[PDB]
Amino acid sequence: QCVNLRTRTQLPPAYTNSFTRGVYYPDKVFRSSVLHSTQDLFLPFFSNVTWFHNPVLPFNDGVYFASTEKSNIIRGWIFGTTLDSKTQSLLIVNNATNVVIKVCEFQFCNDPFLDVYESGVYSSANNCTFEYVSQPFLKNLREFVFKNIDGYFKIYSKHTPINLVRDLPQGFSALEPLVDLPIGINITRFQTLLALHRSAAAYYVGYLQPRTFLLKYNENGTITDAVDCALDPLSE
Amino acid sequence: TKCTLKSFTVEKGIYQTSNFRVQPTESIVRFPNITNLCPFGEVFNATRFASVYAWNRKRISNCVADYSVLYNSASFSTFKCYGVSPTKLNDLCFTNVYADSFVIRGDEVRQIAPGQTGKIADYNYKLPDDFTGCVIAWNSNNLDSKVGGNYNYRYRLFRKSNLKPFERDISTEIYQAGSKPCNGVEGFNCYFPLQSYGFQPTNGVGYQPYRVVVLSFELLHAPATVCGPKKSTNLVKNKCVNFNFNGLTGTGVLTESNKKFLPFQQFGRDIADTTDAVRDPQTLEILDITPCSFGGVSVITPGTNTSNQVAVLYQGVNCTEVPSTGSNVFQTRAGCLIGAEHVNNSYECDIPIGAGICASYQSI
Amino acid sequence: GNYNYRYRLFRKSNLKPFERDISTEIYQAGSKPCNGVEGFNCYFPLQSY
Numbered sequence: 325q326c327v328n329l330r331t332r333t334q335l336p337p338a339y340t341n342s343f344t345r346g347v348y349y350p351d352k353v354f355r356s357s358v359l360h361s362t363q364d365l366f367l368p369f370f371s372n373v374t375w376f377h378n379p380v381l382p383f384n385d386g387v388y389f390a391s392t393e394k395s396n397i398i399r400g401w402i403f404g405t406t407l408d409s410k411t412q413s414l415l416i417v418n419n420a421t422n423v424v425i426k427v428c429e430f431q432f433c434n435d436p437f438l439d440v441y442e443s444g445v446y447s448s449a450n451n452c453t454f455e456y457v458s459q460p461f462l463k464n465l466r467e468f469v470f471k472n473i474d475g476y477f478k479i480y481s482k483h484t485p486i487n488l489v490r491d492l493p494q495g496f497s498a499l500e501p502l503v504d505l506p507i508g509i510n511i512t513r514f515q516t517l518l519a520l521h522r523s524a525a526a527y528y529v530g531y532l533q534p535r536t537f538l539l540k541y542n543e544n545g546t547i548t549d550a551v552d553c554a555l556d557p558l559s560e
Numbered sequence: 561t562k563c564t565l566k567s568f569t570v571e572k573g574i575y576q577t578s579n580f581r582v583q584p585t586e587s588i589v590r591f592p593n594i595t596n597l598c599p600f601g602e603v604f605n606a607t608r609f610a611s612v613y614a615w616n617r618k619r620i621s622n623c624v625a626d627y628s629v630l631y632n633s634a635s636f637s638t639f640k641c642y643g644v645s646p647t648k649l650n651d652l653c654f655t656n657v658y659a660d661s662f663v664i665r666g667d668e669v670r671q672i673a674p675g676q677t678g679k680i681a682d683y684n685y686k687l688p689d690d691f692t693g694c695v696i697a698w699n700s701n702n703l704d705s706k707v708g709g710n711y712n713y714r715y716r717l718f719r720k721s722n723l724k725p726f727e728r729d730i731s732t733e734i735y736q737a738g739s740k741p742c743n744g745v746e747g748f749n750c751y752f753p754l755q756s757y758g759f760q761p762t763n764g765v766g767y768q769p770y771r772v773v774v775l776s777f778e779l780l781h782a783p784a785t786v787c788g789p790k791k792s793t794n795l796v797k798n799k800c801v802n803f804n805f806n807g808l809t810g811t812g813v814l815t816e817s818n819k820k821f822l823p824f825q826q827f828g829r830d831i832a833d834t835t836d837a838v839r840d841p842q843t844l845e846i847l848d849i850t851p852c853s854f855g856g857v858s859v860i861t862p863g864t865n866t867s868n869q870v871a872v873l874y875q876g877v878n879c880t881e882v883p884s885t886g887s888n889v890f891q892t893r894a895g896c897l898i899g900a901e902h903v904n905n906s907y908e909c910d911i912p913i914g915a916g917i918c919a920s921y922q923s924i
Numbered sequence: 925g926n927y928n929y930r931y932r933l934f935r936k937s938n939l940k941p942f943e944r945d946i947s948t949e950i951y952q953a954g955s956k957p958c959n960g961v962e963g964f965n966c967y968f969p970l971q972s973y
């Protein structure tokens with residue numbers, strides 16, 4: 325039921341400044357009114373991230389994803405190495421009622437999309453190993469961080485009400501952990517899924533690098549400010 | 561004091577001898593309400609088991625398996641474990657489980673075992689000699705055997721080769737022992753590999769049907785998922801005890817605290833990596849940890865020549881847990897002092913004690 | 925055939941160093957106590973050569 329479209333929905337690959345977004349709680353420890361220095365994977369400050377207004381993108385160490393969501397156009401993600409039943413494949417879809425996570429060897433069409441009149445982007449599904457159902461994830465800003473370390477898939481998320489027109493705001497907001505999954509995959513690429521009816525989506529992508537950060541914990545244990553040590557000499 | 565000073569005579573003064581510490585009382589464990597039991601009911605209490613050469617396979621992963629109920633269950637005539645002893649099976653576990661269910665005769669029960677050979681063990685299913693796990697066999701003559709003959713069950717009897725480990729053969733190809741090919745019709749040199757069982761309610765012991773389930777455990781590099789429950793006991797308060805809260809092991813006294821954990825933190829620490837607050841997986845409340853008291857001890861003596869009575873001071877210890885009683889006990893900003901009486905007067909300082917007070921000999 | 929030599933096979937707990945234990949008792953392999961009766965889940969710890 326999946327075929328390629330007529331025209332090419334080549335979204336413009338623009339560039340934009342990261343500013344001070346992409347900070348998450350690295351663990352589940354509670355600290356009150358203290359400055360803590362840590363070393364982990366982070367999105368560097370004031371980096372350039374890619375803006376899409378739907379190709380294959382490498383996974384690398386981790387992924388930071390952002391969406392200026394308007395009326396819930398984006399639907400889910402696909403992860404894998406060769407993107408076929410010859411290898412493993414992870415599918416995550418947030419439909420109208422719940423979120424579904426599947427670990428199987430799918431046979432996806434060239435240009436998947438959910439479509440409306442459930443899942444039909446895959447021609448076959450065999451040897452399914454892991455299944456998961458939970459509460460749905462979703463003029464809003466949706467920020468997600470995906471990491472895959474030692475056979476563990478970590479998803480952090482945050483939702484923000486924003487009023488700015490085009491780009492990311494000049495603000496700070498930590499990302500709370502959302503999901504941990506005990507599944508061993510060696511993902512290298514990922515995609516994006518749209519609910520396209522037969523008849524232009526803006527989002528931002530950035531990568532993660534290992535470095536050291538300084539974080540400030542207030543009285544209640546909420547991160548309010550951070551400093552990137554590998555920057556201009558004043559920060560160091 | 562004589563021991564520490566290595567002398568038989570001691571002059572007037574205060575000397576530090578040893579230390580004091582409060583021992584833990586009892587131990588506690590704490591784990592969540594636990595759930596997601598493995599669905600073993602549909603395996604052993606299944607309606608009907610398939611054929612021996614078409615044995616059913618069940619994959620068990622991401623659940624908790626209570627082995628105590630099956631270990632104590634006497635409904636199974638044969639329970640042979642080859643991997644590890646079943647008693648400790650509840651603790652050690654593996655990343656995934658395979659359950660192999662079929663039906664054999666009462667005389668074929670010993671075919672299913674590591675390092676065993678036979679018709680079932682070589683033509684219907686193969687158990688590797690390095691197999692790890694357990695085999696559970698139980699009589700089912702009242703159900704599987706039929707009065708008219710249980711010909712529904714079939715077993716493979718003829719095959720050119722044996723079975724590989726963890727291999728299921730359901731092929732119905734006409735076996736040809738001889739050199740004469742057959743065009744799909746059984747002949748002198750051609751026979752059907754599968755023979756029907758003839759179970760009866762009254763057929764004698766050893767020929768009755770027996771349902772066999774083999775549990776095999778595998779430990780691929782993926783994290784382990786399925787094994788026994790984590791028992792937890794009740795908790796106590798205001799007593800120096802040792803605890804293992806969800807893997808965090810330590811000793812101290814547990815009190816109630818008003819700190820506000822944000823809904824995803826588990827435990828907290830202040831500085832220098834020292835845990836202070838924890839959250840119990842069952843009640844979900846914030847508890848505070850304090851190291852139960854300790855401190856040095858000291859002896860005040862007026863000299864060996866004068867007398868031979870002394871006073872004992874515990875430094876930085878509240879006057880609540882000395883043991884014992886001795887004489888009147890006085891609480892000072894420096895600790896707790898026993899063996900001397902407090903007076904209202906004020907003289908020169910003989911044997912310094914601390915916080916602006918000191919003692920002397922008169923009684924002390 | 926030499927059968928005068930026997931070796932232990934089952935014991936409640938591991939032996940202490942330089943400890944010689946000679947008493948022989950039935951072993952309760954299963955949950956059901958043998959009560960001094962040899963049978964199911966009960967085997968003699970001494971095996972011959």
Ligand SMILES: *[C@@H]1O[C@H](CO)[C@@H](O[C@@H]2O[C@H](CO)[C@@H](O)[C@H](O)[C@H]2NC(C)=O)[C@H](O)[C@H]1NC(C)=O
Nearest residue numbers: 417418419420421422423424442443456457458
């Ligand atoms: C959204 O997805 C969920 C999960 O995939 C759907 O819930 C399933 O609905 C089918 C249809 O009857 C049931 O057979 C399944 O048992 C349901 N899942 C579970 C876990 O119970 C839901 O229907 C989907 N909603 C829409 C609008 O597509």
Ligand SMILES: *[C@@H]1O[C@H](CO)[C@@H](O[C@@H]2O[C@H](CO)[C@@H](O)[C@H](O)[C@H]2NC(C)=O)[C@H](O)[C@H]1NC(C)=O
Nearest residue numbers: 409410411412429450451452453619656778780
């Ligand atoms: C189908 O799934 C099974 C397991 O569900 C896969 O079998 C595993 O294959 C890996 C490959 O190296 C082995 O290391 C494991 O020991 C196998 N058994 C397990 C995990 O239980 C099988 O490879 C899958 N088939 C395909 C084509 O992906």
Ligand SMILES: *[C@@H]1O[C@H](CO)[C@@H](O[C@@H]2O[C@H](CO)[C@@H](O)[C@H](O)[C@H]2NC(C)=O)[C@H](O)[C@H]1NC(C)=O
Nearest residue numbers: 541542543544545546547548818819820821822
């Ligand atoms: C940090 O925690 C404190 C303690 O709960 C918060 O103070 C309370 O905040 C709530 C709602 O914000 C009020 O209803 C209470 O009256 C406050 N308690 C007082 C004033 O004693 C505080 O808001 C939290 N956040 C910050 C930034 O301090």
Ligand SMILES: *[C@@H]1O[C@H](CO)[C@@H](O[C@@H]2O[C@H](CO)[C@@H](O)[C@H](O)[C@H]2NC(C)=O)[C@H](O)[C@H]1NC(C)=O
Nearest residue numbers: 599600601602603604605606629630633634635
């Ligand atoms: C198969 O079903 C039987 C019948 O219910 C189970 O036997 C009972 O198990 C419960 C479990 O707590 C015990 O309280 C009963 O005393 C058992 N009955 C008898 C007569 O012993 C058996 O446990 C089930 N087996 C599996 C694997 O689910």
Ligand SMILES: *[C@@H]1O[C@H](CO)[C@@H](O[C@@H]2O[C@H](CO)[C@@H](O)[C@H](O)[C@H]2NC(C)=O)[C@H](O)[C@H]1NC(C)=O
Nearest residue numbers: 591592593594595792839840841842843844845
């Ligand atoms: C763990 O289980 C206990 C036991 O049922 C739960 O305690 C109950 O909590 C509700 C909510 O206030 C009370 O109304 C019940 O009276 C409690 N029952 C008992 C026996 O204490 C507890 O809520 C559970 N916790 C989690 C996190 O699941």
Ligand SMILES: *[C@@H]1O[C@H](CO)[C@@H](O[C@@H]2O[C@H](CO)[C@@H](O)[C@H](O)[C@H]2NC(C)=O)[C@H](O)[C@H]1NC(C)=O
Nearest residue numbers: 876877878879880881890891892893894895896
């Ligand atoms: C030793 O411990 C006791 C027990 O807490 C302390 O007694 C408390 O004293 C304060 C201050 O007067 C009171 O507010 C509390 O109500 C007392 N607690 C109890 C249970 O009575 C005592 O103060 C401690 N010793 C020292 C020197 O502080």
Ligand SMILES: *[C@@H]1O[C@H](CO)[C@@H](O)[C@H](O)[C@H]1NC(C)=O
Nearest residue numbers: 339340341342370371372373
């Ligand atoms: C965009 O990326 C380029 C490097 O390709 C960089 O020189 C430039 O500063 C970036 N613009 C930003 C971060 O606004």
Ligand SMILES: *[C@@H]1O[C@H](CO)[C@@H](O)[C@H](O)[C@H]1NC(C)=O
Nearest residue numbers: 405412475507508509510511
């Ligand atoms: C992913 O592929 C690499 C390349 O061979 C391999 O070393 C690694 O073990 C694989 N990871 C998983 C989870 O299979």
Ligand SMILES: *[C@@H]1O[C@H](CO)[C@@H](O)[C@H](O)[C@H]1NC(C)=O
Nearest residue numbers: 569572862863864865866867
């Ligand atoms: C006897 O004890 C007193 C106590 O102050 C001391 O001053 C004196 O030197 C002692 N005499 C001795 C040990 O001969």
Ligand SMILES: *[C@@H]1O[C@H](CO)[C@@H](O)[C@H](O)[C@H]1NC(C)=O
Nearest residue numbers: 888890901902903904905906
């Ligand atoms: C004197 O000692 C008594 C003890 O009976 C005490 O109650 C009182 O407070 C003391 N007065 C002074 C001035 O130390």
